[PDB]
Amino acid sequence: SSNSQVEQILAEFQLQAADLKKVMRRMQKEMDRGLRLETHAAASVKMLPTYVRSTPEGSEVGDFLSLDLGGTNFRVMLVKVGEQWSVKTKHQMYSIPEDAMTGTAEMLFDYISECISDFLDKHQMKHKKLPLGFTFSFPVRHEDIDKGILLNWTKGFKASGAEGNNVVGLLRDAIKRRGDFEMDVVAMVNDTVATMISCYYEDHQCEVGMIVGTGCNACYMEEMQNVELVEGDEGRMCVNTEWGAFGDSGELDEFLLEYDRLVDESSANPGQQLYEKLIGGKYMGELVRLVLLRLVDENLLFHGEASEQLRTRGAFETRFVSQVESGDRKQIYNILSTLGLRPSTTDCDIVRRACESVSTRAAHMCSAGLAGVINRMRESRSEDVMRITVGVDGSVYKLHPSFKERFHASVRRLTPSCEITFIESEEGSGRGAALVSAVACKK
Numbered sequence: 499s500s501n502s503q504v505e506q507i508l509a510e511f512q513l514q515a516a517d518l519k520k521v522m523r524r525m526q527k528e529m530d531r532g533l534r535l536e537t538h539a540a541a542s543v544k545m546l547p548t549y550v551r552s553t554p555e556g557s558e559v560g561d562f563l564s565l566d567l568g569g570t571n572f573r574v575m576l577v578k579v580g581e582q583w584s585v586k587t588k589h590q591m592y593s594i595p596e597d598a599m600t601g602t603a604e605m606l607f608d609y610i611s612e613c614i615s616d617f618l619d620k621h622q623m624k625h626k627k628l629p630l631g632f633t634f635s636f637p638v639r640h641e642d643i644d645k646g647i648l649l650n651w652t653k654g655f656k657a658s659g660a661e662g663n664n665v666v667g668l669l670r671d672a673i674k675r676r677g678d679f680e681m682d683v684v685a686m687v688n689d690t691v692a693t694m695i696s697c698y699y700e701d702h703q704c705e706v707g708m709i710v711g712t713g714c715n716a717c718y719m720e721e722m723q724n725v726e727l728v729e730g731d732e733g734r735m736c737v738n739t740e741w742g743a744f745g746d747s748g749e750l751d752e753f754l755l756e757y758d759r760l761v762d763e764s765s766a767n768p769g770q771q772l773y774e775k776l777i778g779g780k781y782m783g784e785l786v787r788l789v790l791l792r793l794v795d796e797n798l799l800f801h802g803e804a805s806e807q808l809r810t811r812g813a814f815e816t817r818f819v820s821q822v823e824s825g826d827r828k829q830i831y832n833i834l835s836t837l838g839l840r841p842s843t844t845d846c847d848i849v850r851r852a853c854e855s856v857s858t859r860a861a862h863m864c865s866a867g868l869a870g871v872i873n874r875m876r877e878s879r880s881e882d883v884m885r886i887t888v889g890v891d892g893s894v895y896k897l898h899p900s901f902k903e904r905f906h907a908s909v910r911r912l913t914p915s916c917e918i919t920f921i922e923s924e925e926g927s928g929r930g931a932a933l934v935s936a937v938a939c940k941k
Protein backbone atom coordinates (compact mmCIF):
# COMPACT_ATOMS: atom_id res chain seq x y z
CA SER A 499 0.00 0.00 0.00
CA SER A 500 1.10 3.55 -0.73
CA ASN A 501 0.39 5.22 2.62
CA SER A 502 1.37 2.32 4.89
CA GLN A 503 4.91 1.95 3.39
CA VAL A 504 5.48 5.62 4.15
CA GLU A 505 4.22 5.17 7.75
CA GLN A 506 6.65 2.19 8.10
CA ILE A 507 9.56 4.50 7.30
CA LEU A 508 8.22 7.31 9.43
CA ALA A 509 7.51 4.87 12.28
CA GLU A 510 11.20 4.48 12.99
CA PHE A 511 11.12 7.93 14.62
CA GLN A 512 8.85 6.62 17.36
CA LEU A 513 10.05 6.32 20.93
CA GLN A 514 8.15 4.21 23.39
CA ALA A 515 7.64 5.14 27.03
CA ALA A 516 10.34 2.58 27.80
CA ASP A 517 12.80 4.16 25.36
CA LEU A 518 12.34 7.55 26.92
CA LYS A 519 12.64 6.15 30.43
CA LYS A 520 15.82 4.42 29.41
CA VAL A 521 17.22 7.64 27.89
CA MET A 522 16.24 9.52 31.08
CA ARG A 523 17.94 7.18 33.53
CA ARG A 524 21.07 7.14 31.42
CA MET A 525 21.10 10.96 31.42
CA GLN A 526 20.97 10.91 35.22
CA LYS A 527 23.88 8.49 35.28
CA GLU A 528 25.97 10.69 32.87
CA MET A 529 25.10 13.71 35.03
CA ASP A 530 26.45 11.98 38.03
CA ARG A 531 29.59 10.95 36.11
CA GLY A 532 30.21 14.64 35.12
CA LEU A 533 29.94 15.83 38.75
CA ARG A 534 32.39 13.38 40.33
CA LEU A 535 36.21 14.07 40.23
CA GLU A 536 36.92 10.38 39.55
CA THR A 537 34.91 10.32 36.25
CA HIS A 538 34.45 14.02 35.27
CA ALA A 539 37.31 14.15 32.73
CA ALA A 540 35.88 11.23 30.66
CA ALA A 541 32.20 12.30 31.10
CA SER A 542 30.16 12.93 27.95
CA VAL A 543 27.89 15.17 30.09
CA LYS A 544 30.36 17.72 31.45
CA MET A 545 28.24 19.35 34.30
CA LEU A 546 30.40 22.48 34.24
CA PRO A 547 30.33 24.69 37.37
CA THR A 548 29.19 28.27 36.60
CA TYR A 549 30.10 30.14 39.89
CA VAL A 550 26.47 31.40 39.87
CA ARG A 551 25.48 30.64 43.48
CA SER A 552 22.24 30.67 45.52
CA THR A 553 22.42 33.87 47.40
CA PRO A 554 20.16 36.35 49.28
CA GLU A 555 18.03 38.30 46.76
CA GLY A 556 19.02 41.66 45.43
CA SER A 557 21.68 43.38 43.47
CA GLU A 558 23.13 46.67 42.74
CA VAL A 559 20.82 49.37 41.50
CA GLY A 560 21.90 50.97 38.25
CA ASP A 561 22.46 50.47 34.55
CA PHE A 562 23.97 47.26 33.18
CA LEU A 563 24.79 46.26 29.62
CA SER A 564 24.46 42.75 28.34
CA LEU A 565 25.66 40.98 25.19
CA ASP A 566 24.15 37.70 24.02
CA LEU A 567 26.13 35.58 21.47
CA GLY A 568 24.83 32.07 20.66
CA GLY A 569 24.07 32.05 16.93
CA THR A 570 24.37 34.15 13.70
CA ASN A 571 21.87 36.44 15.39
CA PHE A 572 22.78 38.35 18.50
CA ARG A 573 21.71 41.05 20.89
CA VAL A 574 22.90 44.02 22.94
CA MET A 575 20.79 45.18 25.85
CA LEU A 576 20.73 47.97 28.40
CA VAL A 577 19.08 46.88 31.66
CA LYS A 578 18.10 49.25 34.50
CA VAL A 579 17.62 47.79 37.91
CA GLY A 580 15.66 50.04 40.34
CA GLU A 581 14.07 49.76 43.76
CA GLN A 582 9.96 47.27 45.34
CA TRP A 583 12.40 46.05 42.62
CA SER A 584 11.97 46.97 38.99
CA VAL A 585 13.88 45.89 35.86
CA LYS A 586 13.49 47.75 32.57
CA THR A 587 15.20 46.82 29.29
CA LYS A 588 16.19 48.22 25.84
CA HIS A 589 17.65 45.96 23.09
CA GLN A 590 19.00 45.96 19.58
CA MET A 591 19.60 42.99 17.31
CA TYR A 592 22.56 42.31 15.05
CA SER A 593 23.13 39.69 12.41
CA ILE A 594 26.68 38.27 12.03
CA PRO A 595 28.05 37.71 8.55
CA GLU A 596 29.58 34.36 7.70
CA ASP A 597 32.95 36.11 7.24
CA ALA A 598 33.00 37.09 10.86
CA MET A 599 32.06 33.65 12.17
CA THR A 600 34.56 31.54 10.17
CA GLY A 601 37.62 33.84 10.22
CA THR A 602 39.51 34.61 13.38
CA ALA A 603 38.32 35.24 16.90
CA GLU A 604 39.70 38.83 16.56
CA MET A 605 37.39 39.41 13.57
CA LEU A 606 34.38 37.98 15.45
CA PHE A 607 35.08 40.13 18.53
CA ASP A 608 35.76 43.24 16.49
CA TYR A 609 32.33 42.87 14.83
CA ILE A 610 30.80 42.40 18.24
CA SER A 611 32.58 45.51 19.50
CA GLU A 612 31.40 47.47 16.45
CA CYS A 613 27.79 46.43 17.32
CA ILE A 614 28.11 47.57 20.98
CA SER A 615 29.40 50.86 19.64
CA ASP A 616 26.30 51.17 17.48
CA PHE A 617 24.06 50.31 20.45
CA LEU A 618 25.64 52.93 22.64
CA ASP A 619 25.54 55.71 19.92
CA LYS A 620 21.84 55.00 19.37
CA HIS A 621 21.14 55.25 23.17
CA GLN A 622 23.26 58.46 23.68
CA MET A 623 25.47 56.70 26.12
CA LYS A 624 28.81 56.08 24.40
CA HIS A 625 30.59 58.21 27.07
CA LYS A 626 29.41 55.93 29.94
CA LYS A 627 31.46 53.13 31.32
CA LEU A 628 29.10 50.40 32.68
CA PRO A 629 29.28 46.91 33.95
CA LEU A 630 28.62 44.32 31.35
CA GLY A 631 27.45 40.78 31.43
CA PHE A 632 28.12 38.38 28.63
CA THR A 633 25.88 35.50 27.73
CA PHE A 634 28.11 33.28 25.68
CA SER A 635 26.30 30.18 24.50
CA PHE A 636 29.13 27.61 24.05
CA PRO A 637 30.88 25.13 26.41
CA VAL A 638 33.18 26.97 28.74
CA ARG A 639 35.23 25.79 31.70
CA HIS A 640 34.63 28.63 34.17
CA GLU A 641 37.28 29.55 36.70
CA ASP A 642 35.15 32.28 38.24
CA ILE A 643 32.09 34.46 37.40
CA ASP A 644 34.18 36.58 34.95
CA LYS A 645 36.68 34.09 33.53
CA GLY A 646 36.13 31.12 31.28
CA ILE A 647 37.92 29.03 28.67
CA LEU A 648 36.18 28.01 25.51
CA LEU A 649 36.36 24.23 25.37
CA ASN A 650 35.03 24.01 21.85
CA TRP A 651 32.76 25.70 19.43
CA THR A 652 29.33 24.20 18.80
CA LYS A 653 26.41 24.84 16.48
CA GLY A 654 28.69 25.52 13.45
CA PHE A 655 31.00 28.29 14.87
CA LYS A 656 34.63 28.01 13.65
CA ALA A 657 36.43 31.31 14.48
CA SER A 658 40.11 30.49 14.94
CA GLY A 659 42.23 31.40 17.99
CA ALA A 660 39.34 31.03 20.47
CA GLU A 661 39.28 27.44 21.75
CA GLY A 662 41.53 27.06 24.76
CA ASN A 663 41.47 30.85 25.34
CA ASN A 664 39.75 33.03 27.93
CA VAL A 665 36.65 34.36 26.15
CA VAL A 666 36.37 37.33 28.46
CA GLY A 667 39.96 38.32 27.50
CA LEU A 668 38.99 38.16 23.84
CA LEU A 669 36.01 40.49 24.51
CA ARG A 670 38.14 42.97 26.44
CA ASP A 671 41.01 42.92 23.96
CA ALA A 672 38.54 43.67 21.13
CA ILE A 673 36.94 46.55 23.13
CA LYS A 674 40.37 48.05 23.71
CA ARG A 675 41.50 47.53 20.05
CA ARG A 676 38.48 49.68 19.05
CA GLY A 677 39.13 52.33 21.80
CA ASP A 678 35.76 53.91 21.15
CA PHE A 679 34.13 53.16 24.55
CA GLU A 680 34.94 51.44 27.84
CA MET A 681 33.07 48.73 29.78
CA ASP A 682 33.82 46.55 32.78
CA VAL A 683 33.14 42.98 31.88
CA VAL A 684 32.02 41.55 35.24
CA ALA A 685 30.32 38.24 34.30
CA MET A 686 30.13 35.59 31.63
CA VAL A 687 27.35 32.99 31.68
CA ASN A 688 25.83 30.32 29.46
CA ASP A 689 22.36 31.11 27.86
CA THR A 690 20.72 28.44 30.04
CA VAL A 691 21.98 30.12 33.10
CA ALA A 692 20.98 33.58 31.97
CA THR A 693 17.51 32.21 31.21
CA MET A 694 17.33 30.62 34.62
CA ILE A 695 18.36 33.83 36.44
CA SER A 696 15.88 36.01 34.51
CA CYS A 697 13.22 33.46 35.38
CA TYR A 698 14.33 33.30 39.02
CA TYR A 699 13.87 37.05 39.23
CA GLU A 700 10.19 36.55 38.39
CA ASP A 701 9.62 33.32 40.31
CA HIS A 702 12.02 32.25 43.02
CA GLN A 703 11.20 28.58 42.47
CA CYS A 704 12.90 28.77 39.12
CA GLU A 705 16.05 26.66 39.50
CA VAL A 706 16.34 25.17 36.01
CA GLY A 707 17.01 26.83 32.69
CA MET A 708 16.60 25.25 29.30
CA ILE A 709 17.20 26.32 25.72
CA VAL A 710 15.70 24.62 22.69
CA GLY A 711 16.99 26.92 19.96
CA THR A 712 19.66 26.37 17.32
CA GLY A 713 21.10 24.18 20.02
CA CYS A 714 19.76 22.38 23.07
CA ASN A 715 21.02 22.54 26.62
CA ALA A 716 20.06 22.95 30.25
CA CYS A 717 21.29 24.12 33.60
CA TYR A 718 20.09 23.63 37.14
CA MET A 719 20.99 24.35 40.79
CA GLU A 720 23.06 21.58 42.43
CA GLU A 721 23.97 21.10 46.07
CA MET A 722 27.57 22.23 46.57
CA GLN A 723 28.58 18.92 48.15
CA ASN A 724 27.62 17.24 44.86
CA VAL A 725 29.76 19.72 42.94
CA GLU A 726 33.06 18.05 43.68
CA LEU A 727 34.93 20.27 41.22
CA VAL A 728 34.43 23.30 43.52
CA GLU A 729 35.44 23.17 47.18
CA GLY A 730 32.63 23.62 49.74
CA ASP A 731 29.41 21.89 50.80
CA GLU A 732 27.13 24.81 51.70
CA GLY A 733 24.42 26.19 49.44
CA ARG A 734 23.85 25.57 45.76
CA MET A 735 25.60 26.31 42.48
CA CYS A 736 24.29 26.41 38.92
CA VAL A 737 25.75 23.61 36.76
CA ASN A 738 25.78 23.93 33.05
CA THR A 739 25.10 20.39 31.95
CA GLU A 740 26.03 20.75 28.29
CA TRP A 741 23.60 17.88 27.77
CA GLY A 742 24.00 18.43 24.05
CA ALA A 743 26.99 16.07 24.21
CA PHE A 744 24.95 13.26 25.71
CA GLY A 745 25.42 10.28 23.44
CA ASP A 746 29.03 11.21 22.64
CA SER A 747 30.20 8.14 24.62
CA GLY A 748 27.72 5.87 22.72
CA GLU A 749 24.84 6.31 25.19
CA LEU A 750 22.26 6.80 22.42
CA ASP A 751 23.58 4.33 19.81
CA GLU A 752 20.40 2.18 19.82
CA PHE A 753 18.19 5.12 18.97
CA LEU A 754 20.21 6.69 16.19
CA LEU A 755 18.93 6.33 12.59
CA GLU A 756 20.50 6.64 9.16
CA TYR A 757 19.58 10.31 8.84
CA ASP A 758 21.10 11.13 12.25
CA ARG A 759 24.49 9.69 11.20
CA LEU A 760 24.30 11.67 7.99
CA VAL A 761 23.48 14.96 9.70
CA ASP A 762 26.43 14.18 11.99
CA GLU A 763 28.96 13.18 9.32
CA SER A 764 28.31 16.45 7.34
CA SER A 765 28.12 18.76 10.41
CA ALA A 766 30.97 21.11 11.44
CA ASN A 767 31.68 18.82 14.47
CA PRO A 768 31.23 15.08 13.57
CA GLY A 769 30.74 12.73 16.63
CA GLN A 770 29.88 15.60 18.98
CA GLN A 771 26.67 17.07 20.31
CA LEU A 772 24.76 13.98 19.18
CA TYR A 773 21.84 14.42 21.56
CA GLU A 774 21.62 18.01 20.42
CA LYS A 775 21.65 16.85 16.78
CA LEU A 776 18.36 14.98 17.54
CA ILE A 777 16.72 18.17 18.77
CA GLY A 778 18.25 21.57 17.97
CA GLY A 779 16.94 24.00 15.37
CA LYS A 780 20.27 23.87 13.57
CA TYR A 781 19.56 20.25 12.49
CA MET A 782 15.82 19.53 12.58
CA GLY A 783 15.20 21.11 9.18
CA GLU A 784 18.05 19.04 7.71
CA LEU A 785 16.85 15.72 9.23
CA VAL A 786 13.49 16.38 7.50
CA ARG A 787 15.14 17.11 4.11
CA LEU A 788 17.12 13.78 4.32
CA VAL A 789 13.89 11.95 5.12
CA LEU A 790 12.12 13.43 2.10
CA LEU A 791 15.10 12.31 -0.09
CA ARG A 792 14.53 8.80 1.29
CA LEU A 793 10.83 9.01 0.37
CA VAL A 794 11.74 10.31 -3.11
CA ASP A 795 14.33 7.60 -3.77
CA GLU A 796 11.78 5.13 -2.61
CA ASN A 797 9.55 6.58 -5.36
CA LEU A 798 7.07 7.43 -2.64
CA LEU A 799 7.12 11.24 -2.86
CA PHE A 800 6.79 13.88 -5.61
CA HIS A 801 6.14 10.93 -7.99
CA GLY A 802 9.86 10.12 -7.43
CA GLU A 803 10.99 13.64 -8.50
CA ALA A 804 13.26 15.88 -6.35
CA SER A 805 14.48 19.40 -7.21
CA GLU A 806 18.03 20.84 -7.09
CA GLN A 807 17.22 22.78 -3.92
CA LEU A 808 16.25 19.49 -2.24
CA ARG A 809 19.47 17.79 -3.46
CA THR A 810 21.40 20.53 -1.55
CA ARG A 811 22.30 20.61 2.15
CA GLY A 812 20.49 23.27 4.28
CA ALA A 813 17.56 24.00 1.99
CA PHE A 814 14.92 22.67 4.36
CA GLU A 815 15.10 25.31 7.00
CA THR A 816 13.88 24.66 10.50
CA ARG A 817 11.60 27.69 10.08
CA PHE A 818 9.90 25.73 7.25
CA VAL A 819 9.28 22.77 9.58
CA SER A 820 7.56 25.17 11.96
CA GLN A 821 5.39 26.68 9.19
CA VAL A 822 4.43 23.38 7.52
CA GLU A 823 3.07 22.38 10.89
CA SER A 824 1.17 25.62 11.75
CA GLY A 825 -5.86 22.02 7.70
CA ASP A 826 -6.61 23.79 4.36
CA ARG A 827 -3.06 22.93 3.18
CA LYS A 828 -2.17 26.60 2.50
CA GLN A 829 1.17 27.27 4.35
CA ILE A 830 2.44 23.76 3.50
CA TYR A 831 1.46 24.55 -0.14
CA ASN A 832 3.48 27.80 0.17
CA ILE A 833 6.72 26.50 1.72
CA LEU A 834 6.90 23.74 -0.93
CA SER A 835 5.89 26.19 -3.66
CA THR A 836 9.30 27.99 -3.45
CA LEU A 837 11.39 24.81 -3.20
CA GLY A 838 10.56 24.04 -6.87
CA LEU A 839 7.86 21.44 -6.23
CA ARG A 840 4.22 20.55 -6.91
CA PRO A 841 2.58 18.79 -4.01
CA SER A 842 -0.35 16.62 -4.84
CA THR A 843 -2.75 17.12 -2.01
CA THR A 844 -1.07 13.80 -0.73
CA ASP A 845 2.51 15.20 -0.77
CA CYS A 846 1.39 18.16 1.39
CA ASP A 847 0.21 15.46 3.84
CA ILE A 848 3.37 13.41 3.62
CA VAL A 849 5.78 16.35 4.07
CA ARG A 850 3.59 17.37 7.03
CA ARG A 851 3.83 13.83 8.49
CA ALA A 852 7.62 13.88 8.06
CA CYS A 853 8.01 17.33 9.75
CA GLU A 854 5.79 16.02 12.52
CA SER A 855 7.81 12.77 12.92
CA VAL A 856 11.11 14.56 13.26
CA SER A 857 9.64 17.31 15.48
CA THR A 858 7.83 14.83 17.77
CA ARG A 859 10.95 12.78 18.28
CA ALA A 860 12.77 16.02 19.26
CA ALA A 861 10.19 16.98 21.93
CA HIS A 862 10.26 13.42 23.29
CA MET A 863 14.07 13.14 23.37
CA CYS A 864 14.21 16.61 24.94
CA SER A 865 11.60 15.68 27.53
CA ALA A 866 13.68 12.73 28.76
CA GLY A 867 16.67 14.89 29.54
CA LEU A 868 14.65 17.46 31.40
CA ALA A 869 12.78 14.75 33.36
CA GLY A 870 16.20 13.39 34.39
CA VAL A 871 17.35 16.79 35.65
CA ILE A 872 14.06 17.40 37.42
CA ASN A 873 13.71 13.88 38.88
CA ARG A 874 17.33 14.03 40.14
CA MET A 875 16.70 17.33 41.94
CA ARG A 876 13.47 15.93 43.48
CA GLU A 877 15.32 12.86 44.71
CA SER A 878 18.14 15.04 46.21
CA ARG A 879 15.56 16.88 48.40
CA SER A 880 12.73 15.99 50.79
CA GLU A 881 9.82 16.19 48.43
CA ASP A 882 6.83 13.98 47.92
CA VAL A 883 5.78 16.37 45.16
CA MET A 884 8.40 18.85 44.05
CA ARG A 885 7.03 22.15 42.77
CA ILE A 886 9.63 23.55 40.39
CA THR A 887 9.84 26.38 37.81
CA VAL A 888 11.80 25.95 34.58
CA GLY A 889 12.85 29.00 32.51
CA VAL A 890 12.84 28.21 28.79
CA ASP A 891 13.99 30.21 25.71
CA GLY A 892 14.82 29.30 22.08
CA SER A 893 13.17 29.53 18.65
CA VAL A 894 12.10 25.86 18.45
CA TYR A 895 10.32 25.86 21.80
CA LYS A 896 8.72 29.31 21.31
CA LEU A 897 7.78 29.28 17.64
CA HIS A 898 7.34 25.63 16.84
CA PRO A 899 3.53 25.31 16.66
CA SER A 900 3.14 22.17 18.75
CA PHE A 901 6.67 21.16 19.73
CA LYS A 902 6.03 22.82 23.07
CA GLU A 903 2.72 21.03 23.80
CA ARG A 904 4.17 17.62 22.88
CA PHE A 905 7.25 18.41 25.07
CA HIS A 906 5.11 19.48 28.01
CA ALA A 907 2.97 16.34 27.99
CA SER A 908 5.93 14.00 27.56
CA VAL A 909 7.78 15.77 30.35
CA ARG A 910 4.82 15.43 32.67
CA ARG A 911 4.37 11.69 32.11
CA LEU A 912 8.00 11.16 33.12
CA THR A 913 7.82 13.37 36.20
CA PRO A 914 4.67 11.98 37.87
CA SER A 915 5.78 13.38 41.32
CA CYS A 916 6.58 16.95 40.27
CA GLU A 917 4.39 19.88 39.30
CA ILE A 918 6.27 21.99 36.89
CA THR A 919 5.78 25.50 35.72
CA PHE A 920 7.37 26.64 32.50
CA ILE A 921 8.28 30.33 32.17
CA GLU A 922 8.92 31.27 28.60
CA SER A 923 11.64 33.92 28.54
CA GLU A 924 10.79 37.08 26.64
CA GLU A 925 14.49 38.06 26.45
CA GLY A 926 15.97 36.15 29.35
CA SER A 927 19.23 34.98 27.69
CA GLY A 928 20.22 38.63 27.52
CA ARG A 929 18.41 39.99 30.62
CA GLY A 930 19.89 37.34 32.94
CA ALA A 931 23.46 38.38 32.09
CA ALA A 932 22.69 41.90 33.32
CA LEU A 933 21.03 40.63 36.47
CA VAL A 934 24.00 38.29 37.29
CA SER A 935 26.30 41.24 36.70
CA ALA A 936 24.28 43.37 39.08
CA VAL A 937 24.58 40.65 41.77
CA ALA A 938 28.33 40.25 41.07
CA CYS A 939 28.79 44.01 41.54
CA LYS A 940 27.12 43.88 44.92
CA LYS A 941 30.38 42.20 45.92
Ligand SMILES: O=C(Nc1ccc(Cl)cn1)[C@H](COCCO)Oc1ncnc2c1cnn2-c1ccccc1Cl
Pocket residue numbers: 549550551552553554555556557579583643695696698699704705719734933934935936937938
Ligand atom coordinates in the same frame (compact mmCIF):
# COMPACT_ATOMS: atom_id res chain seq x y z
O1 LIG B 1 22.83 35.67 40.51
C1 LIG B 1 22.79 34.82 41.40
N1 LIG B 1 23.89 34.30 42.01
C2 LIG B 1 25.18 34.85 41.77
C3 LIG B 1 25.40 35.97 40.99
C4 LIG B 1 26.69 36.47 40.84
C5 LIG B 1 27.72 35.81 41.47
CL1 LIG B 1 29.40 36.24 41.44
C6 LIG B 1 27.40 34.70 42.21
N2 LIG B 1 26.17 34.20 42.38
C7 LIG B 1 21.52 34.20 41.89
C8 LIG B 1 21.44 32.74 41.46
O2 LIG B 1 20.16 32.27 41.85
C9 LIG B 1 19.92 31.03 41.23
C10 LIG B 1 18.69 30.41 41.85
O3 LIG B 1 19.00 29.82 43.10
O4 LIG B 1 20.52 34.87 41.15
C11 LIG B 1 20.07 35.94 41.90
N3 LIG B 1 20.58 36.20 43.10
C12 LIG B 1 20.08 37.26 43.75
N4 LIG B 1 19.14 38.13 43.40
C13 LIG B 1 18.69 37.83 42.18
C14 LIG B 1 19.10 36.77 41.40
C15 LIG B 1 18.32 36.85 40.22
N5 LIG B 1 17.49 37.89 40.26
N6 LIG B 1 17.73 38.47 41.45
C16 LIG B 1 17.29 39.78 41.67
C17 LIG B 1 16.21 39.98 42.51
C18 LIG B 1 15.77 41.26 42.70
C19 LIG B 1 16.41 42.31 42.08
C20 LIG B 1 17.49 42.10 41.24
C21 LIG B 1 17.93 40.81 41.04
CL2 LIG B 1 19.26 40.49 39.99
Ligand SMILES: OC[C@H]1O[C@H](O)[C@H](O)[C@@H](O)[C@@H]1O
Pocket residue numbers: 568635636637652653688689690709711712713714715716740742774
Ligand atom coordinates in the same frame (compact mmCIF):
# COMPACT_ATOMS: atom_id res chain seq x y z
O1 LIG C 1 22.36 27.69 22.87
C1 LIG C 1 21.92 26.48 23.43
C2 LIG C 1 23.17 25.67 23.71
O2 LIG C 1 23.81 25.35 22.53
C3 LIG C 1 24.85 24.41 22.58
O3 LIG C 1 24.35 23.21 23.19
C4 LIG C 1 25.98 25.04 23.37
O4 LIG C 1 27.12 24.16 23.46
C5 LIG C 1 25.41 25.41 24.71
O5 LIG C 1 26.42 25.93 25.48
C6 LIG C 1 24.17 26.32 24.66
O6 LIG C 1 23.61 26.43 25.99
Ligand code: NA
Pocket residue numbers: 722723724725726727728729730731
Ligand atom coordinates in the same frame (compact mmCIF):
# COMPACT_ATOMS: atom_id res chain seq x y z
NA1 NA D 1 31.67 21.21 46.19
